[PDB]
């Protein structure tokens, strides 16, 4: 009887497609036209950070916009002082396979985890004086791709197989688990309020999850290839996704389809990372072509090129206050553009 | 700068020196990677070398050369999103079992386990990340193949077979197939030693292959290639 259920599901999907097609009133390009262009945004490297020895896979900015955590294939988790290029800490890790790193909003905990399919929580402000392991979260049957902090107690981990977990730190247990992705979930971005988070998998789908409830309210499928990085808008109205098909699409939660696409003929590489500048005029996208491109979010135009790296610009990030953008690459460098 | 600033920069300097010494002590350790179907004695080889845990690392040394060995068999994730972390690996140890040419495990209507390992080897060897990394190919059950070829010929697995049903000829045929799977012959080489419950031979071959590959890498980096 699976044929009847399958055809009913197909009919309902057709209903969804018809609904979203009917909701499309006018293109975002037409409405956004007649606005003042961004102009040639000039970006110059204020100061570079050196001391790693392998490829940097992840970086995260503190809420003070002054501290910076960097992860590398070398078993080091350096905490940087952005203003003065001083290394605050040097955290050795049990596994030298790191694919994500997070910095707690309170500034007390740092989480890293990679192919060792376990998330390690570190205490920075320790009474003794050295960085100690607080909790070694285990229970994911796959490499962690992105770990993020809701607060000092809850952490959301982008699993390797199909799932996401709302781990709590006090006890080694998962409060709720998220299923529904048909591929390896890679990116995970949190809303300005820690009530919704969107995730992208290696199956060309993005799902908006309700953290408190535990269900996928909306699903977004506009791309054709794997989704690598997702970043929310300054508000929770929309978000942008980067794919391996040399495109970045701005999806809208309220309207429930894609607003504008960001692609150019000269670009044939992938999107390693993506982030929004404050106030959301500029969309900063990392590329496999060893460069970062400054995309105007409102109008699909290239404001400028952030070209100061040798290799893959794996990790990218903009400070919460908004002064500077820090880009890390596969060479042991991490430059703070502004 | 203030007194706090001098102390902070001194702390940064000592952290930098600790990082440099850790990197210099880590750069002298040979890194290796293992791939196999899962029933190809990879665990058996790992146990022999010593004499949900997605990544497994084993330390061992031999003739004053530290060896880093990583096992990725228990991952169960699509290979593309994590295979680029192992770009600087000195060599890749590919374990394929020559005994189980027949006896498919996944689906009887599907191809043999030898064939699945053949596609795995082709994908790894022709990968764009491993364009300069050698493979130390391994064959696992020397004796099991010997005692199974007598009852069943090599023709039950390959239609284009033409040689006799002897041990040496069948071993040569399988070896030659796995050799000619490679497409960039100049940059990388295949070592293909035969081991089955033999002591002092596996580690000796690994050491010889590692010395050869490090010598060739030194020549390439020293303007003599």
């Amino acid at each position: 009887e699976l044929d009847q259920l399958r055809q009913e599901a197909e009919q309902l999907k057709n209903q969804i497609r018809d609904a979203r097609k009917a909701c499309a009133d006018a293109t975002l390009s037409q409405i956004t036209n007649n606005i003042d262009p961004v102009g040639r945004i000039q970006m110059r490297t204020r100061r570079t950070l050196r001391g790693h020895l392998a490829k940097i896979y992840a970086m995260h900015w503190g809420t003070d916009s002054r501290l910076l955590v960097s992860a590398s294939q070398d078993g080091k988790l350096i905490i940087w002082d952005s203003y003065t290029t001083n290394k605050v800490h040097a955290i050795p890790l049990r596994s030298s396979w790191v694919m994500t790193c997070a910095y707690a909003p309170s500034g007390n905990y740092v989480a890293c985890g990679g192919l060792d399919n376990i998330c390690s929580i570190y205490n920075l402000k320790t009474r003794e004086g050295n960085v100690r392991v607080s909790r070694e979260l285990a229970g994911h049957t796959g490499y962690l791709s992105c770990c993020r902090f809701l607060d000092d107690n809850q952490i959301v981990t982008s699993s390797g197989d199909t799932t996401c977990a709302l781990w709590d730190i006090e006890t080694g247990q998962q409060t709720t688990t998220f299923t529904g992705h048909t591929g390896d979930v890679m990116s995970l971005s949190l809303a300005p309020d820690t009530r919704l988070f969107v995730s992208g998998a290696c199956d060309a789908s993005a799902k908006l999850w309700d953290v408190r409830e535990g269900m996928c309210r909306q699903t977004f499928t506009g791309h054709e290839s794997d989704i690598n990085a997702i970043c929310f808008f300054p508000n929770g109205n929309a978000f942008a996704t980067g794919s391996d098909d040399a495109t970045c699409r701005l999806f809208d939660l309220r309207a429930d389809q894609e607003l504008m696409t960001y692609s150019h003929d000269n670009i044939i590489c992938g999107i390693t990372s993506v982030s929004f500048s404050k106030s959301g005029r500029l969309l900063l996208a990392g590329y496999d072509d060893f460069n970062c491109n400054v995309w105007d979010a409102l109008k699909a135009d290239r404001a400028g090129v952030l070209a100061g790296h040798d290799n893959r610009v794996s990790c990218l990030g903009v400070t919460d206050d908004g002064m500077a953008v820090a880009t890390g690459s596969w060479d042991s460098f991490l430059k703070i553009w502004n | 700068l203030s007194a706090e600033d001098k102390a902070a920069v001194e702390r940064s300097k000592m952290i930098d020196r600790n990082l440099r010494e850790d990197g210099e002590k880590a750069a002298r350790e040979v890194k290796l990677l293992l791939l196999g179907a899962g029933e190809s004695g990879k665990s058996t080889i790992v146990k022999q070398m010593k004499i949900t845990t997605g990544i497994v690392e084993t330390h061992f040394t031999f003739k004053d050369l530290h060896f880093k060995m990583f096992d990725v068999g228990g991952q169960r994730s699509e290979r593309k999103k994590w295979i680029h972390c192992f770009e600087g690996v000195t060599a890749i140890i590919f374990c394929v079992a020559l005994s189980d040419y027949d006896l498919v495990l996944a689906e009887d209507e599907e191809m043999n386990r030898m064939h699945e390992s053949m596609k795995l080897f082709d994908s790894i060897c022709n990968n764009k990340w491993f364009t300069d990394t050698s493979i130390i190919l391994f064959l696992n059950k020397k004796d099991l193949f010997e005692e199974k070829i007598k009852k069943s010929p090599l023709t039950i697995c390959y239609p284009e077979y033409a040689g006799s049903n002897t041990y040496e000829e069948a071993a040569a045929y399988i070896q030659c197939q796995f050799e000619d799977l490679n497409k960039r012959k100049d940059t990388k080489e295949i070592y293909t030693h035969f081991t089955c419950a033999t002591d002092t031979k596996n580690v000796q071959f690994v050491f010889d292959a590692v010395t050869d590959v490090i010598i060739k890498n030194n020549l390439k980096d020293c303007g003599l290639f």
Partner: single-chain antibody
Amino acid sequence: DVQLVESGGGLVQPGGSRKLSCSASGFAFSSFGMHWVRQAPEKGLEWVAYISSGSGTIYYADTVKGRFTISRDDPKNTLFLQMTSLRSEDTAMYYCVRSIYYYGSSPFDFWGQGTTLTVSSDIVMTQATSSVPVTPGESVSISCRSSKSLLHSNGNTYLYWFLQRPGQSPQLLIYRMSNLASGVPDRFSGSGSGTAFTLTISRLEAEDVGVYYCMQHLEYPLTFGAGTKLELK
């Protein structure tokens, strides 16, 4: 937890020499710079030495510049302070003080217990007040002044506040100026600007009684205040 127990000291002839030693107890001693603070029998606090993490900077005082040697050894987690010539003004009880220095750091966290040694320009802090009588509970303010402004170009002032309860070792109350410390309750607070810095305490109890000291951390010849004794009439 962290326990520093310094030891070694008796009677010294007026001109002899002795050696002080403080033993750490499992708090990653090698990563902490260590100080040396002494207390006259009925006077305030001085500062006699400083050895950094890794024995890099060995700043001394202007009165023990040549006759004092400070050294550390990473094994056994011990700090040394060796005397060569002891005067009559060197009689005191010496405190070993831990100090860690980075961006979000709290210098002068743990103080030692003390060893009695009985022999038998620089910024000056006034602390003009000597005794302010207090009630079982009320709002009390402690003031301070500095010769040179401690507001560096970085944007932070470097005046610290310490409390020495009768018969105990000093602690840390506000580890910078207007930056509440750890292990100290929310009653304490600080606020200041320019060269005038003040402390405020909301509710009194049998824990705010003692002597309160100030300290600057701009120029390494560190100075303390005269102290403000609270008596709780």
